[PDB]
Amino acid sequence: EKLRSIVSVGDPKKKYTRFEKIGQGASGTVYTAEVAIKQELIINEILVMRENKNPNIVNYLDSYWVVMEYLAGGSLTDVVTETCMDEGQIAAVCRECLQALEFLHSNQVIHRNIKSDNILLGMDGSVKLTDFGFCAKRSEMVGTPYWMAPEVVTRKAYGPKVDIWSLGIMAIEMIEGEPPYLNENPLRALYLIATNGTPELQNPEKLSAIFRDFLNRCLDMDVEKRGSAKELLQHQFLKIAKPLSSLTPLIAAAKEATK
Ligand SMILES: O=C(c1ccc(Cl)cc1)c1c[nH]c2ncc(-c3cnn(C4CCNCC4)c3)cc12
């Protein structure tokens, strides 16, 4: 009823052809057509994408199925799992991510599902945020276990800074290939986030002092003492960032590895 009155009219096979099933998710099934097409909470997802238009957010085009811009570079997931990123490369991705979060938070929107799987890359090195299926001071236990802030896990009145935590977990993936406790169960991971809070790196000695600082400001247990997207954009670590072209050899490596 509300849904039909938002979505455009017509057969979703009248405007688009060459349907090649690229991915599969719990949310739906992602196809390519160049555009990308997927097939109460579904209403919230569409409206959020329409009103919050930033170059650091995957551009929403139309609905009937959802139609978006196609980012040929793939997901940050293949880069974090198949390649080794240098600190400059990690800083470049973090800066673009905080630029997406800054824009969302300022416009009073919490993402709640920040992870590498929701980071799409352009063939030019562009870093863009997607999946607003979970977006919303707040009190519902929503997200992906391994990326959830402890206050979300423990069922406390959480805010926009929960996205800063998951970004800190996403920095761990960039370093190690996986979020902390990925070997464990999603349920075991939940107990571990609540009981341990700040996760440890397997090899912190390998990181620089600024990168160790940026990580501790993303993963601070005290919400007030944890950084905001505005605060972290001016961080020392973000100054060592590389141009976004430094990410295109990473994209080339992930394509070759996942073939
Ligand atoms: O998924 C959505 C999306 C759809 C609907 C909604 Cl409401 C939100 C988001 C994409 C939107 N624009 C995209 N641009 C590129 C890709 C992409 C490139 N490569 N790949 C991979 C190929 C191998 N299998 C794993 C995925 C996926 C995916 C999307």
Last residue of a domain, one of 54, 70, 86: 70
Round to whole Å and give the CA distance between 172 and 177: 8
- The verdict on 56 and 94 lying in the same domain is no
Nearest CA to ligand 1 atom 19: 74
Q: Which of 116, 130, 121 is nearest to 54 (CA)?
A: 130
- The verdict on 101 and 157 lying in the same domain is yes
Structure determination technique employed: X-ray
Find out whether the beta carbon of 70 lies less than 6 Å from any atom of ligand 1.
yes
Last residue of a domain, one of 45, 70, 95: 70
Q: Tell me whether strands 127-129 and 29-32 are parallel, antiparallel or unpaired.
A: unpaired
- The verdict on 98 and 224 lying in the same domain is yes
Radius of gyration of the chain (CA): 18
Question: What residue has token string 């709640």?
Answer: 112
Count of beta carbons in the 10 Å neighbourhood of residue 245: 10
- The verdict on 199 and 254 lying in the same domain is yes
- The verdict on 15 and 102 lying in the same domain is no
105-to-54, 66, 92, 184 alpha-carbon distances in Å: 12, 24, 20, 32
Count of beta carbons in the 10 Å neighbourhood of residue 249: 12
Q: Which of 156, 185, 188, 182 is nearest to 170 (CA)?
A: 182
For position 17, which CATH number holds? 3.30.200.20
CB-based contact 105:228 (threshold 8 Å):
yes
Last residue of a domain, one of 18, 37, 70: 70
- The verdict on 23 and 129 lying in the same domain is no
Report the amino acid identity of residue 203: N
Buried b (16+ CB within 10 A) or exposed e, 161-190: bbbbbbbbbbbbbbbeeebbbeeeeeeebb
- The verdict on 142 and 235 lying in the same domain is yes
Instruction: Resolution in Å, one decimal, please.
Output: 2.4
Q: Which of 222, 154, 146, 226 is nearest to 186 (CA)?
A: 146
Q: Which of 168, 187, 188 is nearest to 179 (CA)?
A: 168
166-to-6, 14, 45, 115, 142 alpha-carbon distances in Å: 31, 39, 20, 6, 12
For position 82, which CATH number holds? 1.10.510.10
Round to whole Å and give the CA distance between 164 and 48: 19
Alpha carbon of 70 to ligand 1 centroid (Å): 7
Tokens matching residue 73 = 């570079």
Collapsing DSSP to helix, strand or coil, 44 comes out as: helix
Alpha carbon of 23 to ligand 1 centroid (Å): 7
- The verdict on 38 and 59 lying in the same domain is yes
Alpha carbon of 207 to ligand 1 centroid (Å): 32
Report the amino acid identity of residue 80: V
Range of the domain at 4: 1-70
- The verdict on 61 and 151 lying in the same domain is no
Find out whether the beta carbon of 207 lies less than 6 Å from any atom of ligand 1.
no
Task: Encode 137-197 in three state secondary structure.
Answer: CECCCCCCHHHCCHHHHCCCCECCCHHHHHHHHHHHHHHHCCCCCCCCCHHHHHHHHHHHC
Round to whole Å and give the CA distance between 112 and 121: 20
Nearest CA to ligand 1 atom 12: 70
Q: How many domains does the chain have?
A: 2
